[PDB]
Amino acid sequence: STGSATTTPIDSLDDAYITPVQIGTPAQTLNLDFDTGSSDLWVFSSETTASEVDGQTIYTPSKSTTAKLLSGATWSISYGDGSSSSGDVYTDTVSVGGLTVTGQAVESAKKVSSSFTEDSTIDGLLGLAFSTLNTVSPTQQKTFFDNAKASLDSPVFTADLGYHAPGTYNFGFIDTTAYTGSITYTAVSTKQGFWEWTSTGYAVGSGTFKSTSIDGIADTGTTLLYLPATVVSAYWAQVSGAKSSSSVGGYVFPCSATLPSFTFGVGSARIVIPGDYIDFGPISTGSSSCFGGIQSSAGIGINIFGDVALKAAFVVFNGATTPTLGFASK
Numbered sequence: 001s002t003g004s005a006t007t008t009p010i011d012s013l014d015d016a017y018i019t020p021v022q023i024g025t026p027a028q029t030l031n032l033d034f035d036t037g038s039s040d041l042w043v044f045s046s047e048t049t050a051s052e053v054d055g056q057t058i059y060t061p062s063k064s065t066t067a068k069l070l071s072g073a074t075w076s077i078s079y080g081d082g083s084s085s086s087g088d089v090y091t092d093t094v095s096v097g098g099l100t101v102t103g104q105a106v107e108s109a110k111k112v113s114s115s116f117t118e119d120s121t122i123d124g125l126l127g128l129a130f131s132t133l134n135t136v137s138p139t140q141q142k143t144f145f146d147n148a149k150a151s152l153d154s155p156v157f158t159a160d161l162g163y164h165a166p167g168t169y170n171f172g173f174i175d176t177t178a179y180t181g182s183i184t185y186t187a188v189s190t191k192q193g194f195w196e197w198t199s200t201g202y203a204v205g206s207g208t209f210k211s212t213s214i215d216g217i218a219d220t221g222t223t224l225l226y227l228p229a230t231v232v233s234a235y236w237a238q239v240s241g242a243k244s245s246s247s248v249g250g251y252v253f254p255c256s257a258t259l260p261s262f263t264f265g266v267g268s269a270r271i272v273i274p275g276d277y278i279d280f281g282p283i284s285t286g287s288s289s290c291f292g293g294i295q296s297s298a299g300i301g302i303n304i305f306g307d308v309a310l311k312a313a314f315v316v317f318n319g320a321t322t323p324t325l326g327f328a329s330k
């Protein structure tokens with residue numbers, strides 16, 4: 001089997017991407033944030049505290065003839081930005097782009113933090129990291145990809161995120177029309193539960209490439225590119241008037257600037273992030289200070305190749321017995 005679904009930016013900044021997902025019988029379609037940096041499929045639901053729902057579409061298990069309470073199971077997750085959610089668990093039929101999993105754990109939110117409530121466009125998350133990170137207790141649950149893997153034509157999914165435009169998530173096949181050149185594959189460590197790999201270095205604009213190992217994760221659920229402070233300082237030093245602002249919480253730059261590109265290495269290959277991809281616009285409406293798309297990872301404990309980096313490539317998440325990542329230009 002295979003599946004193919006379009007993923008769409010939630011706003012004009014590409015702050016996140018939403019993909020329609022069918023849950024239950026008859027289908028209830030919710031728009032979920034596919035997140036290769038976590039491993040829980042959770043949704044706004046009829047059980048979510050009413051004051052914490054503001055415009056989201058909810059899953060109602062009592063209206064699904066295939067829903068079954070997973071008795072005794074609870075879940076609770078906190079993400080790296082301080083957001084969180086928790087609740088109980090059903091199993092139900094879940095389909096993505098024509099690919100169907102029966103008995104998928106659907107984690108029903110009883111509580112969500114303010115950042116989720118305030119984002120009316122995101123109806124939940126669909127985790128695509130390794131199932132060892134799943135938070136369901138006392139019986140850990142498998143991701144949608146882990147459950148589908150054996151049925152897929154090939155044990156892979158691909159992320160093809162757009163810049164200010166829709167893109168695609170495919171399951172079970174590699175669309176050879178969706179990229180240019182060849183795909184360069186690189187080793188993955190699953191020891192922390194992430195799609196963790198080592199970039200071979202970077203360049204700023206037309207500058208020379210610096211060969212240096214940068215360990216980080218491929219994370220579709222994080223907006224920005226978070227890298228070591230040395231690398232990020234070298235980038236922003238090329239933008240007149242750019243500075244790190246403690247009050248804003250990162251690097252800002254004059255909105256009148258033209259940003260340089262940023263290149264990262266994948267083995268001997270190179271992925272170029274155009275400068276425009278690094279502009280996240282005014283810090284507040286009408287401000288002439290703009291927020292940068294490359295930020296320091298120093299406070300996080302891991303480097304994160306988020307959407308800013310991944311949307312410059314066609315990315316293969318290879319879930320063979322020894323997992324690997326593939327990157328191609330497009």
Ligand SMILES: Oc1cccc(CNc2ccccn2)c1
Pocket residue numbers: 035037038079080081083221222223300304
């Ligand atoms: O580790 C991180 C460090 C900084 C920012 C983020 C954001 N990532 C999220 C937020 C909510 C849901 C999924 N991913 C993660």
